[PDB]
Amino acid sequence: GVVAAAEKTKQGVAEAAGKTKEGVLYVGSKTKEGVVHGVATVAEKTKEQVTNVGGAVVTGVTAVAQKTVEGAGSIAAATGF
Amino acid sequence: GVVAAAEKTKQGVAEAAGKTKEGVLYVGSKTKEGVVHGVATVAEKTKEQVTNVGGAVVTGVTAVAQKTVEGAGSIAAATGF
Amino acid sequence: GVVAAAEKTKQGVAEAAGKTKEGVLYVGSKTKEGVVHGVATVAEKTKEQVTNVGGAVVTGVTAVAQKTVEGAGSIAAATGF
Amino acid sequence: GVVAAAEKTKQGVAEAAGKTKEGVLYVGSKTKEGVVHGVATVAEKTKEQVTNVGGAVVTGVTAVAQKTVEGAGSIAAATGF
Amino acid sequence: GVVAAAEKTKQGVAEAAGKTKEGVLYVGSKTKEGVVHGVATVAEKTKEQVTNVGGAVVTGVTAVAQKTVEGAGSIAAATGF
Amino acid sequence: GVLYVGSKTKEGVVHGVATVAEKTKEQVTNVGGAVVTGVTAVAQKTVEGAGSIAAATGFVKKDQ
Amino acid sequence: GVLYVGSKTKEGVVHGVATVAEKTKEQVTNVGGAVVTGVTAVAQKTVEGAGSIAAATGFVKKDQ
Amino acid sequence: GVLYVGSKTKEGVVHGVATVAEKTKEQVTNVGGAVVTGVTAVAQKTVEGAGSIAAATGFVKKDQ
Amino acid sequence: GVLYVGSKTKEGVVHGVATVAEKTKEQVTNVGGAVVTGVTAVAQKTVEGAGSIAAATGFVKKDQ
Amino acid sequence: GVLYVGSKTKEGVVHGVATVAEKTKEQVTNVGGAVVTGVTAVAQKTVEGAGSIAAATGFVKKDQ
């Protein structure tokens, strides 16, 4: 039985809301998931040498965001039967 | 029975809402998932040497966003039977 | 039986709300999950040498955000039968 | 039976709310989960040598955020049958 | 039977709330879970040598945030049958 | 010989101004004055010179 | 010979100004004055010079 | 020979200004004066010079 | 030969200003004066020079 | 030859200013004076020079 009223004014508002459910507001909100940020480096002689044989290798800079409902999520999987 | 009213004014508004469900608002909101950002580097002699044999190798800068419902999500998968 | 009223004014508002459920507000809120941030380095001679054989290797900078409902989540999985 | 009223004013407000449930507000709130931050380093000769054989190795800088409902979450899993 | 009233003023407010349940407010609140922060280092000769065989090794800087409902959460799991 | 490789430089920059107004009742009765109830994002960079107004929003100027 | 490799530089920068107003009743009755009830993000960078107003929002100027 | 590798530099920076106003009743009756009830984020960087106003919000100037 | 590798530098920085106002009744009756009831984040960096106002919010100036 | 590797430096920094006002009744009746009831975060860094006001909020100046 919600009721609002505003009479005999010069400016007037009358808002009436029987039921309300607000919602989510993201205002200027940031969100990082799996992020590499600002990696500086200074060197004179750099050498990277990977020697993989029948396996999984993951090197260097890397950012992985990964959702998996029904699977064996991984970043480097090696298997043998 | 929501009711609103505004009489005998010079300016007037009358809003009436029996039911409301707001929704999501993203206003100026950022979102990063699997991001590599701002990678500086200074060198004089750089050498990268990968020697892969029957395997999975993932080098260098990399950003992976990966959703997988019913599969073995990975970044480098090696397998043998 | 909510009721509001504002009479005989020069400016007037009348708000009436029988029921309310507010919602989530993210205003300028940040959120990091699995983040590598600001990695400096100074060297003269750098050498990285990986020698993987039938296994899983994960080196270098890395940021992993990983949700997994029904799977063996990992970052480096090795298996043998 | 909530009731509000404001009469014979020059400025007036009349708010009436029969029931209210506020919601969560994140205002300028930060949140880090699994973060590596600000890693400096100064060296003259750096050497990293990994020699993995049939196992799981996870080196270097790393940040892992990882939720897992029904799985053996890990960072480096090795197994044999 | 909550009731408010404000009559014969120059400025007036009348708020009436039959029931209220406030909500959580995070205002400028920070939160870290599994964080490595500010790791300095100065060296002349650095050497890291891992020799893993059929096992799990986790070295270097690392930050792990990890929730697991129904699984054997770990950081380095080794198993044999 | 300078070098800029991927460098950034922000001088006089307004960036990321969000704003929301939900169900906000508002009533104004202005008489010969200024009223400002709105967003206003202003940037400016003046190397030199004189009298460089970058924004004059919602004002009343009655000089003599 | 200088070098800038991925460097950043913010001089006079306004960044990330959020604002929300929910169900806020507001009533103003201004008479020959200034009223400001709104967001205002202003940046500025003046190397040299004179009289460089970057923003003059919602004012009343009656000089003589 | 200087070097900047991933360096940052903030000079005169306003950053991350959040604000919320929920169900806030507000009533103003201004007469020939200034009233400010709003967000205001101002940055500035002046190397040299003179009289560099960066923001003059919501004021009343009646000089003589 | 200097080096900056991942260095940071904040000079005159305002950072992270949160604010909430929930159900706050407010009533003002200003007459020829200043009233300020709002957020205000101001930064500034002036190397040299003179008379560099960075923000003059909500004031009343009646000189002679 | 200096080195900065991941160093930080805060000079004149305001950081992390939270504020909440819940159900706060407030009533003001100002007459020719100043009233300030709001947040105010101000930073400043002046190397040298003169007369560098960084913020002049909510005031009344009537000189002669």
3-state SS string for I29-42:
EEECCEEECCCCEE
Phi, psi dihedral angles at E10 (to 5 degrees): -105, -35
Contact between chains at D29 and I6 (C-beta distance less than 8 A): no
Contact between chains at G20 and A27 (C-beta distance less than 8 A): yes
Q: What does the radius of gyration of chain J's CA atoms come to, in whole angstroms?
A: 19
- Label residue E51 left, alpha or beta by phi (over 0 means left) and psi (-120 to 50 means alpha): beta
Beta bridge partners of G60: F60, H60
Phi, psi dihedral angles at H8 (to 5 degrees): -125, 160
Q: What is the DSSP string of B11-61?
A: EEEEEEES-EE---EEES---EEEEEEEE--B-SEEEEEE--BSSEEE-SS
Q: Does F contact E via 3+ CB–CB distances below 8 Å? A: no
- Label residue B38 left, alpha or beta by phi (over 0 means left) and psi (-120 to 50 means alpha): left
Token reading at B47: 């050498």
- Residue in B with minimal Cα distance to G4: B40
The shortest CB-CB distance from F20 to any of B27, B38, B40 is to B27
Q: What is the resolution of this structure in A?
A: 3.3
Q: How far is Cα G55 from Cα G45, in angstroms, rounded to an integer?
A: 13
Looking at chain H, the number of H-run helices and the number of E-run strands are: 0, 8
Within 13 Å, how many C-alpha atoms sit on residue D27's CB side? 27
Min Cα distance H48 → chain E (Å) is 35
Do the annotations mark residue J15 as ligand-binding? yes
- This entry's atomic model was obtained through cryo-EM
Is the four-CA dihedral E71, A32, A25, H37 of positive or negative sign? Answer: positive
- What do you get for the CA distance between the two ends of chain B, in Å? 72
SS3 at position F43: coil
The 3 state secondary structure assigned to D4-66 is EECCCCCEEEEEEECCCECCCEEECCCCEEEEEEEECCECCEEEEEECCECCEEECCCCEEEE
Min Cα distance A39 → chain B (Å) is 5
Give whole-number Cα distances, C48 to A50, B44, C59, E50, G58, in Å: 8, 16, 9, 12, 62
- What do you get for the CA distance between the two ends of chain A, in Å? 72
Q: What does the radius of gyration of chain A's CA atoms come to, in whole angstroms?
A: 29
Q: How far is Cα G56 from Cα G21, in angstroms, rounded to an integer?
A: 24
F contacts of C27 (beta carbons < 8 Å): 18
The shortest CB-CB distance from H13 to any of I13, I34, I50 is to I13
The 3 state secondary structure assigned to A29-76 is CCCEEEEEEEECCECCEEEEEECCECCEEECCCCEEEEEECCCCCCCC
Q: How far is Cα I55 from Cα I42, in angstroms, rounded to an integer?
A: 7
Q: Which chains touch I (3 or more CB pairs under 8 A)?
A: A, C, D, E, G, H, J
Min Cα distance H59 → chain F (Å) is 9
Q: After which residues is chain H broken (C to N over 2.5 A)?
A: none
- What do you get for the CA distance between the two ends of chain F, in Å? 55
Q: How far is Cα G15 from Cα A28, in angstroms, rounded to an integer?
A: 10
